[PDB]
Amino acid sequence: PDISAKDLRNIMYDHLPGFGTAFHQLVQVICKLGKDSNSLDIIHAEFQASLAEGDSPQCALIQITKRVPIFQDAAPPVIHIRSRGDIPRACQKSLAPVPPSPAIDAGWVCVFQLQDGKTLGLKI
Ligand SMILES: [K+]
Ligand code: NA
């Protein structure tokens, strides 16, 4: 790819406010699935265009989830953690009960699964 997953992640991070936000996590999800589906260059191009159009970087990421085929009805990744405390502070107000068939394109970034089995969905 013209761009690596790490470099794309860093370009997206360059534009995002704060640290450990729902959108940082979304960047990670996007770069993972994009690397796996060989979509890194299309993702990069779409991100660039969205920024040029005047979109917020957050909106650009969302639009990526809506336009890039790998994200269509794609299940959010499950992230195993010890306790809710392992969830970044800036994500703590973005947690919600997990529905039966969550989809990334619908704003379900990931699902945090606690050791005790309880789940929390990261929602935008
Ligand atoms: K930042
Ligand atoms: Na952010």
Q: Residues 8, 54: one domain? A: yes
Same domain, 58 and 105: no
Experimental approach taken: X-ray
Ligand 2 mean position, distance from CA 67 (Å): 21
If you write DSSP's letter for every residue of 25-61 in order, what string do you get?
Answer: HHHHHHHHHHHHTT-HHHHHHHHHHHHHHT--HHHHH
How far apart are the C-alpha atoms of 59 and 63, rounded to whole Å? 6
Q: Residue 87: give the domain boundaries.
A: 73-124
Number of domains the chain contains: 2
Which of 47, 72, 97 terminates a domain? The answer is 72
Q: Strand, coil or helix: what is 122?
A: strand
Instruction: Let me know whether 51 and 84 are in one domain.
Output: no
Distance CA(22)–CA(96), nearest Å, equals 12
Distance (Å) from CA 26 to ligand 2 centroid: 10
CATH number assigned to the domain comprising residue 26: 1.10.8.950
To one decimal, the resolution in angstroms is 1.9
Name which of 40, 41, 104, 116 is nearest 77 in CA terms. Answer: 104
Tell me how far the alpha carbon of residue 39 is from its chain's centroid: 15
Same domain for 68 and 54: yes
Beta bridge partners of residue 112, listed in sequence order: 79, 120
Centre of ligand 1 from the C-alpha of residue 101, in Å:
31
Q: Do 114 and 85 share a structural domain? A: yes
